[PDB]
Design an enzyme around this catalytic site. Structure first.
Site, PDB file in Angstrom:
ATOM      1  N   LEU A  16       0.796  -1.089  -0.102  1.00 31.10           N
ATOM      2  CA  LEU A  16      -0.105  -0.044  -0.210  1.00 31.10           C
ATOM      3  C   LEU A  16       1.058   1.257  -0.193  1.00 31.10           C
ATOM      4  O   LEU A  16       1.331   1.582  -1.127  1.00 31.10           O
ATOM      5  CB  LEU A  16      -0.842  -0.048   1.251  1.00 31.10           C
ATOM      6  CG  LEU A  16      -2.591   0.285   0.872  1.00 31.10           C
ATOM      7  CD1 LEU A  16      -3.211  -0.938   0.250  1.00 31.10           C
ATOM      8  CD2 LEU A  16      -3.232   0.961   2.164  1.00 31.10           C
ATOM      9  N   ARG A  49       0.024  14.060   2.943  1.00 31.82           N
ATOM     10  CA  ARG A  49       0.361  12.548   2.749  1.00 31.82           C
ATOM     11  C   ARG A  49      -0.171  11.578   3.825  1.00 31.82           C
ATOM     12  O   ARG A  49      -0.190  10.537   3.574  1.00 31.82           O
ATOM     13  CB  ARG A  49       1.720  12.484   2.865  1.00 31.82           C
ATOM     14  CG  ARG A  49       2.498  12.754   4.235  1.00 31.82           C
ATOM     15  CD  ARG A  49       4.285  12.697   4.164  1.00 31.82           C
ATOM     16  NE  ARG A  49       4.686  13.148   5.270  1.00 31.82           N
ATOM     17  CZ  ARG A  49       4.763  14.393   6.047  1.00 31.82           C
ATOM     18  NH1 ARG A  49       4.843  15.633   5.127  1.00 31.82           N
ATOM     19  NH2 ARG A  49       5.268  14.513   7.335  1.00 31.82           N
ATOM     20  N   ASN A  50      -0.514  12.172   5.102  1.00 28.98           N
ATOM     21  CA  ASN A  50      -0.849  11.327   6.041  1.00 28.98           C
ATOM     22  C   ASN A  50      -2.693  11.488   6.477  1.00 28.98           C
ATOM     23  O   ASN A  50      -3.128  11.113   7.199  1.00 28.98           O
ATOM     24  CB  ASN A  50      -0.339  11.842   7.448  1.00 28.98           C
ATOM     25  CG  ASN A  50       1.019  11.346   7.494  1.00 28.98           C
ATOM     26  OD1 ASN A  50       1.487  10.327   7.392  1.00 28.98           O
ATOM     27  ND2 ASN A  50       2.028  12.273   8.131  1.00 28.98           N
ATOM     28  N   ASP A  73      -2.353   7.618  10.394  1.00 28.52           N
ATOM     29  CA  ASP A  73      -0.924   7.610  10.832  1.00 28.52           C
ATOM     30  C   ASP A  73      -0.795   7.927  12.037  1.00 28.52           C
ATOM     31  O   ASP A  73      -0.160   8.933  12.440  1.00 28.52           O
ATOM     32  CB  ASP A  73      -0.150   8.004   9.861  1.00 28.52           C
ATOM     33  CG  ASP A  73       1.564   7.882  10.086  1.00 28.52           C
ATOM     34  OD1 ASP A  73       1.854   6.936  10.867  1.00 28.52           O
ATOM     35  OD2 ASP A  73       2.392   8.302   9.294  1.00 28.52           O
ATOM     36  N   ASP A 114       2.425  14.834  13.765  1.00 26.26           N
ATOM     37  CA  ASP A 114       2.542  14.599  12.233  1.00 26.26           C
ATOM     38  C   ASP A 114       1.623  14.745  11.161  1.00 26.26           C
ATOM     39  O   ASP A 114       1.199  13.901  10.114  1.00 26.26           O
ATOM     40  CB  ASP A 114       3.398  13.085  11.837  1.00 26.26           C
ATOM     41  CG  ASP A 114       4.185  13.029  10.475  1.00 26.26           C
ATOM     42  OD1 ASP A 114       4.154  14.093   9.834  1.00 26.26           O
ATOM     43  OD2 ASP A 114       4.412  12.081   9.890  1.00 26.26           O
TER      44      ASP A 114
END
Ligand SMILES: CN[C@@H]1C[C@H]2O[C@@](C)([C@@H]1OC)n1c3ccccc3c3c4c(c5c6c(n2c5c31)CCCC6)C(=O)NC4
Length: 262
Positions: free
Chosen positions: A15, A129-130, A143, A125
């Site tokens: 993934l 992207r997360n 995440d 974070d």
């Protein structure tokens, strides 16, 4: 318990690593984050699982189940067909993913962070992207590895920790002081990602000059067509002094408002 049976899941492909899975029993596609037996992020992976158990919100990726009795270890979560928001935004047709859609994504994400802010969690974070995407521009925060529930207002990172500089707030870069406020900073940068359809922050600048530039009071210019109140929020999110930053309750409220006037 969330403890459940390994055998119920047909695995598929890539993934510690994430795989597409199928929970046979319920005809259902899932994500399974796995851990290879020996390698001791056993400490750090069970902590992620433990955190996920305590959190629940329609804009946070949902823990469905786990295998932690016996290795290979499995965290099972709900699957999000369209994957990470940064590649989603970059790769999309923007006529469909339009100005108002962007505003919903930001609004969803704020909703989940006000929730985390209420429980006293830091994500630590937060970034395009997360974030993961589903059908009809559902977005959820994901995440949770570095997410802590803080006692007190301040998690301090260990020295020689490695940060994503260009998302990290000044007091975090100097003193390793993280807080809700430091995620507010992070969120502001993510708005900048959303507003540009996934450009990398401080474009063209080396990591080694970023802090000095923030100290001399440099901030990323307003991106094309960003609303005025969106840019205002980005700029309050980038106050040098964290007390001067807004809160996630404040930000979400402003987004709720802005979003209905659309
Ligand atoms: C042992 N039972 C499982 C616990 C878990 O995952 C399953 C596979 C199962 O529960 C119905 N599940 C579904 C299967 C088919 C359609 C919807 C769901 C589903 C759903 C949810 C859910 C949850 C858990 N499970 C859920 C769900 C674990 C505890 C928190 C929430 C949920 O919150 N909405 C649909």
């Amino acid at each position: 318990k969330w403890e459940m049976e390994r055998t119920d899941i047909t695995m598929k492909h890539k993934l510690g690593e994430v795989y597409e899975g199928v929970w046979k029993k319920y005809s259902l596609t899932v994500a399974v984050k796995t851990l290879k037996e020996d390698t001791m992020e056993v400490e750090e992976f069970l902590k992620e699982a433990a955190v996920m158990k305590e959190i629940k919100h329609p804009n946070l990726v949902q823990l469905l189940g786990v295998c932690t009795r016996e290795p290979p270890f499995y965290i099972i979560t709900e699957f999000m067909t369209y994957g990470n928001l940064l590649d989603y935004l970059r790769e999309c047709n923007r006529q469909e993913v339009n100005a108002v859609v962007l505003l919903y994504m930001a609004t969803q994400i704020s909703s989940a962070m006000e929730y985390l802010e209420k429980k006293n969690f830091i994500h630590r974070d937060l970034a395009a992207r997360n974030c993961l995407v589903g059908e009809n521009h559902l977005v959820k925060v994901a995440d949770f590895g570095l997410s802590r529930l803080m006692t007190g207002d301040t998690y301090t990172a260990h020295a020689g920790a490695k940060f994503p500089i260009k998302w990290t707030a000044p007091e975090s870069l100097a003193y390793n002081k993280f807080s809700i406020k430091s995620d507010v900073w992070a969120f502001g940068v993510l708005l900048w990602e959303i507003a540009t359809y996934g450009m990398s922050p401080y474009p063209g600048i080396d990591l080694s000059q970023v802090y000095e530039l923030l100290e001399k009071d440099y901030r990323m210019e307003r991106p094309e067509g960003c609303p005025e109140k969106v840019y205002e929020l980005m700029r309050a999110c980038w106050q040098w002094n964290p007390s001067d930053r807004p809160s996630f309750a404040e930000i979400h409220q402003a987004f709720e408002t802005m979003f209905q006037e659309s």
